[PDB]
Ligand binder design. Sequence first.
Ligand code: NA
Length: 429
Amino acid sequence: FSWGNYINSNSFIAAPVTCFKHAPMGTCWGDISENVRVEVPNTDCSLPTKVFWIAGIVKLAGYNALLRYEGFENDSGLDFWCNICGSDIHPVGWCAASGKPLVPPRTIQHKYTNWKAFLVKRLTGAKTLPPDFSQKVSESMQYPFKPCMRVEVVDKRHLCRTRVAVVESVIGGRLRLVYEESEDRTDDFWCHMHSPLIHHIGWSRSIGHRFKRSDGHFDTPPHLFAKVKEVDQSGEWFKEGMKLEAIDPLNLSTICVATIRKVLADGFLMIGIDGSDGSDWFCYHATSPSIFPVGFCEINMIELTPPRGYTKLPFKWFDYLRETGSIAAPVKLFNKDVPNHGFRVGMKLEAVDLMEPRLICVATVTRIIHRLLRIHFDGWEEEYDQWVDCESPDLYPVGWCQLTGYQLQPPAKTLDSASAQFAASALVT
Ligand code: NA
């Protein structure tokens, strides 16, 4: 499987890197656009040694760039895909700086006679990578989470409690965790290091969350954990028994009828899916975009999943509130920003399968409802589509798996004339 070929064959569009709050280089992507010029190996050569040429970005698909050698003009016949963050991608001037040769592609070697004048007139006023781009890329893939670090995380077999887990490995900022005293040896849980699921040692005791009573393993420094958003300070709050709609943490395809079962400290809530010990309950922060007011699904034309075993169907909230003698959580408690992240229906990305989070897959955004993206797994049925927040750390740009070395599941300031002249000095015909 090749993202470039899939995108070129189908005329697909990819979500830009800047759409992704948590993506490597998200906040250094201003320099990257169509017509940026780079120095890259010239594969259109039969020379003993590796040589380079200039190429321009024809198309960007996340981290992946479709490049055209300079001097091909409109001739797309040798257009090639690369990861723009790859180590063979250099700013213009890198050859002259490094004593490497710029050699015309063989295909166009007689198309121009004065190669130095050609390069000067093409490179003068061009956009290239910043000189530290390479270093920003290397820094974007140093993660402060390390093997042997301990965290608190939900027990996937008993959502109502946490237990301690250890980092086994870190790939692209994703943690492979094993539970301490696990039922098996290894590989129990995958999440992003900025997942809201993981907490400092002491978190559960501190907020009132149930926990399983408890090499070289050490407590993750508390400062490494994602900040929790502050709640509305008015003095009106969630109460036990209030009704709402929530994403089922065991079925990310469904939004369900739900109940506030316990108010914890620091804005955390134990929530139950109605009709399904207290063993079932799962913790959402009050600022979670995975919870919604009564009537959210109906107003936004989303299927609501009714309580397991409830027989007055199709489900009507007015009747269920009266039958159960309960009230809706006030709509004001769920007000939040909808960032302008620039996702559009049809855009391609790499998505975590949240029902099997080890898998990162070829995926499409197929619906947008404020913050909420409907994520489709290309080649699978729509029934397996998942509800995912637009700022989720489980969504990646096209090319993220290639950048970080994670396995991808396939579908089922311009240069001045002195800079141009400097760059062109590396020319060997
Ligand atoms: Na395992």
